[PDB]
Amino acid sequence: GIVEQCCTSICSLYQLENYCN
Amino acid sequence: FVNQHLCGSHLVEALYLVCGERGFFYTPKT
């Protein structure tokens, strides 16, 4: 899931945008 | 923006900034 990407590596602001609309 | 691994509360506080006034949600897992 997207949470893993941000926990184990570095979510850029572009990846972070997915958590909202 | 500053690079950091983002988990737990760090992820939540980062999302406030990126999503701004739109708000956001999180998917916890008990």
Curated annotation (Swiss-Prot), chain B:
Domain of life: Eukaryota
Effect of H10D: In HPRI; Providence
Effect of F24S: In HPRI; Los-Angeles
Listed result of changing R22Q: In MODY10; reduces binding affinity to INSR; reduces biological activity; reduces folding properties
Protein name: Insulin B chain
Organism: Homo sapiens (Human)
Record lineage: Eukaryota, Metazoa, Chordata, Craniata, Vertebrata
